[PDB]
Design a protein around this ligand. Structure first.
Ligand code: 5XM
Length: 111
């Protein structure tokens, strides 16, 4: 029922990305939390090879499967690239992926 020190440090890097807010308090995390089902957006699953969202990321961290931080980063990094593939470069999701990308990386250097 407990959480390894590595788990507690993956939760921290996870939570900072989720809770990041822009200059007038919007949470960029919102659109990325969870994808609509295959039945509700087949185009996404037919155009993006390996679909990723944050609660799916959450289910492996809280459950067990990340050996270090950069292991979790690559599913985050992967998720963003998916968003930036499916959405056009000037789209909002696209830039929020970009901004959150740096947050993830700004957080990890802080160890
Ligand atoms: O790449 C992604 N793209 C989208 N979501 C995501 C949610 C979690 C992870 C990736 C993505 C939310 C759906 C959304 C894209 N959005 C779908 C409706 C039409 C406008 C674009």
């Amino acid at each position: 029922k407990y959480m390894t020190p590595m788990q507690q440090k993956l939760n921290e890097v996870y939570e900072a990305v989720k809770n990041y807010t822009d200059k007038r308090g919007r949470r960029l995390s919102a659109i990325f939390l969870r994808l609509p089902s295959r039945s509700e957006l087949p185009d996404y699953y037919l155009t993006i090879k390996k679909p990723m969202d944050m609660e799916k990321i959450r289910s492996h961290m809280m459950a067990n499967k990340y050996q270090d931080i950069d292991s979790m980063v690559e599913d985050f990094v992967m998720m963003f690239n998916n968003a930036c593939t499916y959405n056009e470069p000037e789209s909002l999701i696209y830039k929020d992926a970009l901004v959150l990308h740096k947050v993830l990386l700004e957080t990890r250097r802080d160890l």
